[PDB]
């Protein structure tokens, strides 16, 4: 029938795609999620959007997925759609491995997903995937990288970006404090706790309210570990002792 | 110029002496008249005080008890809203005042005196009567059947009623004009409005939507009461979509108010009511919406479509609007019409304005061939992005 058709794959009089534009606004409500590049590895930080006293944790992370041995990504938006896109990624990256018998390059993994996100906006009449992702990765053509895809099907490399709740406020704080080069992984974790603390309206962060996962290179293999609560709790104390010594001017 | 600067001094000051003495020997202001003729009026007003029947308190007859009896009696219903049995007039023949007729009575002994001027009720309806606008039948292009249909059914039967009764027919009453917005449904009616020289009463569709239940229907009722008296009228319901609806039930009385007003309009052009001899124009732009019982012949006998003009029309219409402005020698008006796709007459009005504008913007005194192709680009291409004609054209 035609009465009950939404027509989700059709232009506006203005020159937009309304469904892809609304999907953006649905991402402005998900948890904050930022990523910072360094010279000595790269790290994703995301705040746990769902927290509670009864809620449990069973998995190494509730927002960070491992797509390969060398790549992880964080999602933002409709959690249900995120269980779909992260399963196609894993399957893409093994299908690459099954031919060339290498680990897939960082850039290609993304575009290959963005052909699927982009297909849905152009024909078939399904609602688009309402998810944006950050991909931290490592390959042998560019070293560490960071990338960000949209429900449109646009992606870009970044050196430090943010997606989801209060993204524009994070990025304003990164433009100022982030140096081109000159970033060690110790320094990036200082910037990541400071930026996260400013876009979230809680008095202070807690090792049980965020998740910081790094991606380092140690011994020619990639390592992707998620900081325990003790490792993050150190970072939170060293930031309060930089706010106590950020009143020594008066 | 000391001579003529001196002339300018007393050309201001002396004309001011003129006004000064005019006021010294007439004197007017926040006074009700010019005070020049009413000084004698005053001495007729001292005869208006002697006029003791005046003031006369106005009421309405409702019921005649006896008429053949030597002593007619009436039942007057006055405005204090107490009712009196009264005598007949003291001179006016008792044949003149029937029941219903509004009639003025004396206030001391409620003696009926002066028959009226009935149907006061017309207060808003009063203002629908017209005073001839400024457009004629030459200012309209696409003069095909379009305008010759309409004259035939609305203007010719009022100028030459002898040739329709000699043949033995009866010409048709109503005429529906409908077309995409800006194609001369109103223009073609602004036209017939003055040339007709017969009473012309146009109502604006929205002005019959009232506040109180069935006040709208009253409005319509009073409108034809007034038009039946004035022998041979037009009524021109402009843009009827309000009160143009179509019956339908669903939910809680949707449009049940407006809908009922329409039934009254329907009912008075087709009920029993023979009705005098009043023609009726209705110019919608959305005929798809009108109720079938409002649309079928015998209430709206001839439907005139105002389709978008063709090539030949356009060429005609450019001449009708541009002839009035200064244009260089050789304007291919036939090329500005190939260059228009399906355009409204009102799109071409706009083109000519802007060809004038570029000539004004650049400080030249004459629009050239370039100025049109440029202004025809601006007004059609750009502004066509948000045109009515595309979408509004299916409801047509």
């Amino acid at each position: 029938s035609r009465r009950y058709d939404s027509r989700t794959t059709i232009f506006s009089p203005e020159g937009r795609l309304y469904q892809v534009e609304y999907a953006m606004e649905a991402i402005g409500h998900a948890g904050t999620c930022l990523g910072i590049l360094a010279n000595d590895g790269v790290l994703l930080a995301a705040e746990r959007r769902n927290i509670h006293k009864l809620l449990d944790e069973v998995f190494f992370s509730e927002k960070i997925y491992k797509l390969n041995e060398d790549m992880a990504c964080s999602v933002a938006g409709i959690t249900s759609d995120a269980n779909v896109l992260t399963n196609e990624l894993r399957l893409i990256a093994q299908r690459y491995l099954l031919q060339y018998q290498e680990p897939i390059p960082c850039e290609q993994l993304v575009t290959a997903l963005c052909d699927i996100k982009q297909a849905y906006t152009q024909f078939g009449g399904k609602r688009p995937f309402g998810v944006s992702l950050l991909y931290i990765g490592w390959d042998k053509h560019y070293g560490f990288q960071l990338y960000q895809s949209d429900p449109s099907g646009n992606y870009g490399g970044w050196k430090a970006t943010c997606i989801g709740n209060n993204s524009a406020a994070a990025v304003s704080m990164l433009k100022q404090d982030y140096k081109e080069g000159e970033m060690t992984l110790k320094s990036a974790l200082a910037l990541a706790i400071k930026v996260l603390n400013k876009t979230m309206d809680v008095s202070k962060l807690s090792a049980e309210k965020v998740e910081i996962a790094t991606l380092t290179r140690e011994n020619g293999k990639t390592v992707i570990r998620v900081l325990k609560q003790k490792e993050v709790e150190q970072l939170i104390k060293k930031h309060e002792e930089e706010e106590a010594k950020a009143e020594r001017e008066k | 110029q000391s001579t003529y600067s001196r002339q300018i001094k007393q050309v201001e000051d002396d004309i001011q002496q003129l006004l000064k003495k005019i006021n010294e020997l007439t004197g007017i202001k926040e006074s009700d008249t010019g005070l020049a003729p009413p000084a004698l009026w005053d001495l007729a007003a001292d005869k208006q005080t002697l006029q003791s029947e005046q003031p006369l308190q106005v009421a309405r007859c409702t019921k005649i008890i006896n008429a053949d009896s030597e002593d007619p009696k009436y039942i007057i219903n006055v405005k204090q809203f107490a009712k009196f049995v009264v005598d007949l007039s003291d001179q006016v023949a008792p044949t003149d005042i029937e029941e219903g007729m509004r009639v003025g009575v004396d206030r001391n002994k409620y003696q009926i005196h002066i028959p009226l001027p009935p149907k006061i009720d017309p207060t808003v309806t009063m203002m629908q009567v017209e005073e001839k606008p400024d457009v004629t039948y030459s200012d309209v292009g696409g003069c095909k059947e379009q305008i010759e249909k309409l004259r035939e059914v609305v203007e010719t039967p009022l100028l030459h009623p002898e040739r329709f009764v000699n043949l033995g027919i009866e010409p048709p009453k109503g005429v529906l004009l409908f077309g995409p917005p800006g194609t001369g449904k109103t223009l073609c009616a602004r036209a017939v409005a003055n040339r007709t020289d017969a009473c012309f009463i146009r109502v604006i569709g929205s002005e019959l939507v009232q506040k109180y239940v069935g006040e709208g229907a009253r409005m319509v009722r009073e409108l034809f009461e007034m038009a039946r008296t004035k022998k041979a009228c037009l009524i021109f319901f402009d843009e009827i979509d309000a009160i143009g609806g179509a019956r339908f039930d669903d939910g809680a009385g949707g449009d049940n108010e407006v809908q009922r007003t329409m039934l009254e309009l329907i009912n008075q052009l087709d009920g029993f009511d023979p009705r005098g001899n009043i023609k009726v124009l209705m110019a919608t732009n959305r005929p798809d919406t009108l109720d079938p019982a409002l649309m079928r012949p015998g209430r709206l006998d001839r439907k005139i479509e105002f389709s978008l003009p063709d090539l030949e029309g356009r060429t005609h219409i450019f001449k009708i609007h541009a002839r009035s402005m200064s244009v260089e020698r050789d304007i291919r008006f036939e090329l500005l019409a190939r260059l228009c796709p399906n355009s409204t007459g009102a799109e071409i009005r706009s083109v000519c304005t802007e060809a004038g504008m570029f000539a004004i913007r650049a400080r030249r005194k004459i629009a050239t061939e370039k100025d049109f192709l440029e202004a025809v680009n601006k007004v059609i291409k750009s502004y066509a992005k948000f045109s009515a004609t595309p979408r509004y054209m299916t409801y047509n």
Partner: protein, 234 residues
Amino acid sequence: YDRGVNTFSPEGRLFQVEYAIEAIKLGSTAIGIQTSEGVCLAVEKRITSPLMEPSSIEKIVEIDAHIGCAMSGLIADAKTLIDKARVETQNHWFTYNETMTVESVTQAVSNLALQFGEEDADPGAMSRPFGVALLFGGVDEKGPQLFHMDPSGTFVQCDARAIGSASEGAQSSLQEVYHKSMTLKEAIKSSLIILKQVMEEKLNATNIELATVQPGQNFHMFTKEELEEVIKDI
């Protein structure tokens, strides 16, 4: 307010098809005159800048070495038709071995004209009628013939047709200047006189395309040099 792609107007004919006709009145002008000497097709390019190459515009295309064509309307939609015409004429040459009658080609192109169909077809059928009218002029065994084919699938033979944004104007000036006893040099000169009134800019050697198809030749488009010679005479 939405309806199907296959709705009849209560009037009596197909909404879309009645519309696709209006898309012609936006297109360039083409004029075809049929003679006993051959067919000529003249169509104005209508360049929009001085920066455009007045040569990568193709509004006369060869269908075979004896069947020309001229498009007016949305020249983008012709791409699909022209290529069906060619592969039609070739298949007819690969089986029956012999040229194809001009009428038969135009019939085979017109069978696609009504073929849209929102559903109950392939995931590949057209969705909307074609936006383009054609002038197939060729020479076969009946001598020269010129056919006109619009987006209604109704094709018909003409002695001289004009289409486009000067269909009304030019068609009336063909009726006064056409007659059976012409030669090809009279026609090419007759059409460019009609085509010079209905254009918007001056008639150069870069503002038209001429082609002819003659019994004793192939389809032969006139180059920028040969055009100078017939605009000199006018």
